[PDB]
């Protein structure tokens, strides 16, 4: 027949999977004027995107929510955003001093205010003091009568965070650099892995508020009007149960103690702060959930927990194991840290709740062992309403307990749709044509 | 090189015979001497505030050069200076008459006349001509 | 307070279509390939350094500035058992670049040193008359 010759094409719409660098592209309003928002790092890239979207309608791309790289690039960056911000603030090495702590006039908690001699920046004469110290940060030392010492002296350094900054979790949109198209599944029956039907293409991902909480997920993002629950093997016992429920469950948590301002001794140009006085009467902080909807919720969960084996033996159980930082429910609220007891939330089922919250001050970094941030609060009481669009469970009559040791799994619940592919725009094909040759 | 920014469009094409006043030639006679290797005779001696800024300066010298070659490259007008196309001008873009655009007008005012409409003209060259002619050329090689 | 439907095409919009329908679409994937706390800058060079390579390989092949062009390198039927009209009417590009992935290095050497190197020593010596 005819002779065929190769023919070069450019801009051919193909891709392979690649692992490249994405970049922050945040909000850009009210970042100026004292907003030292540590998530924004003063509005990281000021884009405020217009997230357009192109449907492709003939494309099947075999996704995977479990071998995704985008969740790995967050957990690199978030502690990396801490580490530059943890640097210039005040170091707290010279404070690990033996104490004399007595009972405070209006349980185990704030009973002990303390006193110790220190000579930080004057470097001439020591001076005793008065502070306010909770539990969960002190140790009654040996061979002495009522003498305390901070729990994390002989770890790495105990640098605090500065009061200019704010940990306010504004939504961050991950955009893609040139030559990379972030894709997104358009099937809401997407169970986590496998193929999709009519994958689209966005410039930039949707709202991701990088909140930090164990055992739940607060200001999250929720699917349509079925409850979807995904996991890795979903038969294996030591995996993580990602729960996406179709409605929100409203939460109130408050700190009724009128904590105030304060003046503690100065480092070298470094004023250090330790929580000033309460107004004179102590009410212990608590979360406060509308317990009807929560009771309504968990029977709705075993509707969709069930349909992978039989029609029998569903229960709910509370957590277990170790010190209360991994036991009790952890989350932040506006420059303040909460460890709340959540044993009441996990009664079993069949086919207004007040929770005792606990607050500490010396708080470990989230995954590294070693350094640890620190922040005394601002004046007044604290209130933050919130939401719930998910929780983290484990397998163990088939026992479900609230597990959790990685908020990447929270970010896996946020990024269960996305995939970044590089363009290989050059391509060739044969036809009958031929270059003119003389 | 901006010597005729107050001249008119019907007259600025006269002095544009010089290579846009040797436009790109000023870059190569710069980067021959921007690439004075005294930067390599020091390794900058450190990382300094200026070398951070020079690095962010050379990138924009790279990128914004390419965005003007690529658009000339895609328009079937690679490397030339005055090329015609096959796209018919639509009077909805500008209802100015002929001589007013050329004889009686600056350049930068004419930018603000069609800075709205500019992006539509970009697509209406490629998908109308340079996407289009390549298929019709390849049909004329089928025989 | 805006919004209208699609007019021309989208980005990667032809990537589920056939070759005969995607061949009239190449400009949209051609424009936006380049334009789009140090870690933005490390992206802004890789996006350049990938663009030059694809630009350079078109330059060597006598095919710079054109979107498509032909050569005189013969297609070898050992590379593809696919019939002709199946390729231009049934197969998408994303599938097509898994099928000729292995042969790609043989192709690029057999364009330059085969023809466009040879079309210059032949070209330079068509003088003297």
């Amino acid at each position: 027949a005819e002779q065929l010759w190769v023919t070069v094409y450019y801009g051919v719409p193909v891709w392979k999977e690649a692992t490249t660098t994405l970049f922050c592209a945040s909000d850009a309003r009210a970042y100026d004027t004292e907003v030292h928002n540590v998530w924004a790092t003063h509005a990281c890239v000021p884009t405020d995107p217009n997230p357009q979207e192109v449907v492709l309608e003939n494309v099947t791309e075999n996704f995977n929510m479990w071998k995704n790289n985008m969740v790995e690039q967050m957990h690199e960056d978030i502690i990396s955003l801490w580490d530059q911000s943890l640097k210039p603030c005040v170091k707290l090495t010279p404070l690990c001093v033996t104490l004399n702590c007595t009972d405070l006039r209006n349980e185990g908690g704030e009973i002990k205010n303390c006193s110790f001699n220190i000579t930080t920046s004057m470097r001439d004469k020591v001076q005793k003091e008065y502070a306010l110290f909770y539990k969960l940060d002190v140790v009654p030392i040996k061979n002495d009568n009522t003498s305390y010492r901070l729990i994390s002296c002989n770890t790495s350094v105990i640098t605090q965070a500065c009061p200019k900054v704010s940990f306010e979790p504004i939504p961050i949109h991950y955009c893609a650099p040139a030559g990379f198209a972030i894709l997104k599944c358009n099937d809401k029956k997407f169970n986590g892995t496998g193929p999709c039907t009519n994958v689209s293409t966005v410039q930039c991902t949707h709202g991701i508020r990088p909140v930090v909480s164990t055992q739940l997920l607060l200001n999250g993002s929720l699917a349509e009007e079925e409850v979807v629950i995904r996991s890795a093997n979903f038969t294996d016992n030591a995996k993580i149960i990602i729960v996406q429920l179709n409605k929100s469950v409203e939460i109130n948590c408050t700190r009724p103690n009128n904590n105030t301002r304060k003046s503690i001794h100065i480092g070298p140009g470094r004023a250090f702060y330790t929580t000033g006085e309460i107004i004179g009467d102590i009410r212990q902080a608590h979360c406060n959930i509308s317990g009807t909807k929560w009771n309504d919720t968990l029977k709705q969960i075993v509707v969709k927990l069930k349909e992978q084996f039989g029609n029998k033996t569903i229960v709910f159980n509370h957590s277990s194991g170790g010190d209360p930082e991994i036991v009790m429910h952890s989350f932040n609220c506006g420059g303040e840290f909460f460890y709340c007891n959540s044993t009441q939330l996990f009664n079993s089922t069949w086919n207004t709740i007040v929770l005792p919250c606990r607050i500490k001050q010396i708080v470990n970094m989230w995954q590294e062992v070693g350094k640890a941030m620190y922040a005394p609060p601002i004046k007044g009481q604290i209130r933050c309403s919130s939401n719930i669009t998910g929780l983290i469970l484990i397998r163990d009559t088939e026992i479900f307990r609230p597990g959790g040791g990685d908020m990447r799994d929270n970010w896996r619940s946020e990024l269960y749709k996305y995939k970044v592919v590089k363009i290989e725009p050059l391509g060739i094909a044969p036809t009958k044509a031929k270059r003119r040759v003389v | 090189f901006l010597g005729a920014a107050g001249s008119t469009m019907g007259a600025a094409s006269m002095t544009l015979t010089v290579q846009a006043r040797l436009l790109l030639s000023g870059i190569v006679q710069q980067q021959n001497n921007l690439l004075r290797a005294i930067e390599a005779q020091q390794h900058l001696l450190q990382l300094t505030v200026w070398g951070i800024k020079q690095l962010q300066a050379r990138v924009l010298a790279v990128e914004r050069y390419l965005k003007d070659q690529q658009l000339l490259g895609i328009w079937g007008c690679s490397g030339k200076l005055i090329c015609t196309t096959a796209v018919p001008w639509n009077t909805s873009w500008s209802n100015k008459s002929y001589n007013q655009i050329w004889n009686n007008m600056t350049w930068m005012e004419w930018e603000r006349e069609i800075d709205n409409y500019t992006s539509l003209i970009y697509t209406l060259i490629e998908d109308s001509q340079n996407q289009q002619e390549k298929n019709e050329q390849e049909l004329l090689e089928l025989d | 307070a805006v919004g209208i439907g699609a007019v021309f095409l989208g980005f990667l919009g032809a990537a589920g279509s056939t070759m005969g329908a995607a061949s009239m679409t190449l400009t949209v994937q051609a424009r936006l390939l380049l334009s789009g706390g140090i870690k933005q800058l490390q992206a802004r060079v890789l996006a350049v350094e990938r663009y030059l390579k694809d630009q350079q390989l078109l330059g060597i092949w006598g095919c710079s500035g054109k979107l498509i062009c032909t050569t005189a390198v013969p297609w070898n039927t050992s590379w593809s058992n696919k019939s002709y009209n199946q390729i231009w009417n049934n197969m998408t590009w994303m599938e097509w670049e898994r099928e000729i992935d292995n042969y790609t290095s043989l192709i690029y050497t057999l364009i330059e040193d085969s023809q466009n190197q040879q079309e210059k020593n032949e070209q330079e010596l068509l003088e003297l008359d």
Partner: antibody
Amino acid sequence: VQLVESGGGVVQPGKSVRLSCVVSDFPFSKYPMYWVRQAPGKGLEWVAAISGDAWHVVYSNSVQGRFLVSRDNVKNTLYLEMNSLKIEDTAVYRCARMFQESGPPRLDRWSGRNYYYYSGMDVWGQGTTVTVSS
Amino acid sequence: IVMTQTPLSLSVTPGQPASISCKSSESLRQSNGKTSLYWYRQKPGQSPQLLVFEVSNRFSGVSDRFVGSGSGTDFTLRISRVEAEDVGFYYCMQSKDFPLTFGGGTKVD
């Protein structure tokens, strides 16, 4: 400038009329228009909107599909035709001009889709009134 | 979206400052760099007239004592030394997206 309407009055259910707002002096093809509905003793309800080139039309959900709007930039007219009339449509209609100027449609590069900008109103016509009853 | 306001009735006499705020459910900040909230006034029996278009700027034929401000959700219109002819209603009108709604219109006597 001068901004009034015409064709108002009173009709039955199931009927169909068309008003006529006429502008005076500004270049009419440059600007988009609107329609608003103040019920007697109530607030205001937005009705409709046309682009400047008469290409983009956005209706309220309640009156969706029933009404009709159009432009004639040469005759400088503005029409609100209506169909399938109900008694609760009895209110004051007002013809109204956008405050700002609008541009031509935009055509974002990344997706071949135009964009017509829409902002609010400054010049309300005094407007007619249509009553739907027996 | 939803956007109501408060208080409905402020039956006053001239000589004092006050303010009327309109409360937003969806936050307003368009990508142009501005917040499309338009405050204006009708008189009884009349088609309305524009008080201020943006929450910052004003309109022609407007006394200087008409000041407005607000965040993306909080929105406030303040009238210093409330004038004798401030009768009728005051509608808060937003221009985020469609259908663009109103407030009820605060009556001031």
